[PDB]
Scaffold this active site. Structure first.
Site, PDB file in Angstrom:
ATOM      1  N   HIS A  50     106.965 -21.142  29.549  1.00 30.92           N
ATOM      2  CA  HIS A  50     107.668 -21.255  28.271  1.00 30.92           C
ATOM      3  C   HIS A  50     109.103 -21.746  28.468  1.00 30.92           C
ATOM      4  CE1 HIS A  50     109.038 -17.015  29.285  1.00 30.92           C
ATOM      5  NE2 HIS A  50     110.176 -17.636  29.032  1.00 30.92           N
ATOM      6  N   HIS A  82     114.123 -15.554  27.294  1.00 33.35           N
ATOM      7  CA  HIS A  82     112.882 -15.117  27.937  1.00 33.35           C
ATOM      8  C   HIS A  82     112.312 -13.814  27.371  1.00 33.35           C
ATOM      9  CE1 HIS A  82     113.598 -18.184  31.002  1.00 33.35           C
ATOM     10  NE2 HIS A  82     114.836 -17.731  31.097  1.00 33.35           N
ATOM     11  N   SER A 126     116.339 -22.874  29.227  1.00 34.62           N
ATOM     12  CA  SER A 126     115.912 -22.307  30.501  1.00 34.62           C
ATOM     13  C   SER A 126     114.395 -22.277  30.635  1.00 34.62           C
ATOM     14  CB  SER A 126     116.475 -20.891  30.647  1.00 34.62           C
ATOM     15  OG  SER A 126     116.097 -20.312  31.880  1.00 34.62           O
TER      16      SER A 126
END
Lengths: 173, 173
Positions: free
Chosen positions: A106, A32, A101
């Site tokens: 995104h 992330h 994830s």
């Protein structure tokens, strides 16, 4: 540079099937970290077992860093590798970012499920559940990438070897 | 370059006190990786709570890599740092290699307990248990380093940013 493809479920159903909905491309980054964009999502298919995703790691900078870190780890089967075995970079990625994830905003390759390969077909064929119809749904989507403009403004990666180390430590911390 | 000192117990007694013995310098490396030697053990003292160790991270190459990875992590309190707060490198190391692991053959900074600082006294003062007599036993030992030949043949570190990433992934794997 030759891309690396990645696939895996972003969620199993056993998010609800109706929610995820049973039937623009999200970027792919590391843990992330927006400064660590390495590619894009090529396809998403809702299947029997859940929401399956398939992406492409295209960043030449990220890939070169991975290649160098791979040549220095006990995770990779050293010695020359035969054409019948997944290459060193593929094997290292499978070990450093074993998961996917979701955020859709995104998808992040997570270091702390995901299968990596040099061919989406091979990757998809690594998941027994997925049926031909599933693979066909996935194919129709990523085949569009061949005439879709990606990385046109250049490598989307805005970090370096030092940053990946920080990023890795941060995630694990 | 200015060294970073590290301290912590290599074993608590609650290895037996008599075994460890209740009363040449082991090198310090990263996750037991001989290609990642970053310094040496300066002192070892058997105390009430266990076997306490204090080392010095001297490698200019390892330290420079850490400095760069630190400037890129959410583990460090960004913004200028005041003289009353542990520096960025000290804080990053405390987060990436939070532990000490014995092998005596050598001591490894382990990424998966250890206190880092720019002064052995400050480091030692971070452990309540340790008594003055304990600190005095530790001091008599590391004070010898001031006239002991270390890193004479040069920086003992034989890796790079890429290798540390591999080393980190390997350990976590």
């Amino acid at each position: 540079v030759a891309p690396v493809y990645v696939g895996g479920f972003l969620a199993r159903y056993d998010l609800p099937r109706d929610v995820v909905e049973h039937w623009v491309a999200l970027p792919l980054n590391i843990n992330h970290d927006d400064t660590a964009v390495v590619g894009h999502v090529a396809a998403m298919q809702s299947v029997r077992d859940g929401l399956f995703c398939l992406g492409c790691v295209t960043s030449p900078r990220f890939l070169e860093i991975v290649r160098r870190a791979s040549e220095k780890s006990e995770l990779v089967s050293r010695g020359p590798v035969s054409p019948l075995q997944p290459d060193k970079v593929v094997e290292f990625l499978s070990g450093s970012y074993a998961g996917l994830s979701l955020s859709f905003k995104h998808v992040a390759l997570c270091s702390v499920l995901a299968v990596y390969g040099r061919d989406p077909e091979w990757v998809t064929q690594r998941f027994p559940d997925l049926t031909a119809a599933d693979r066909d749904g996935l194919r129709a989507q990523w085949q569009r990438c061949g005439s879709t403009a990606v990385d046109a403004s250049g490598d989307p990666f805005r970090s370096d070897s030092y940053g990946l180390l920080g990023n890795y430590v941060d995630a694990l911390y």
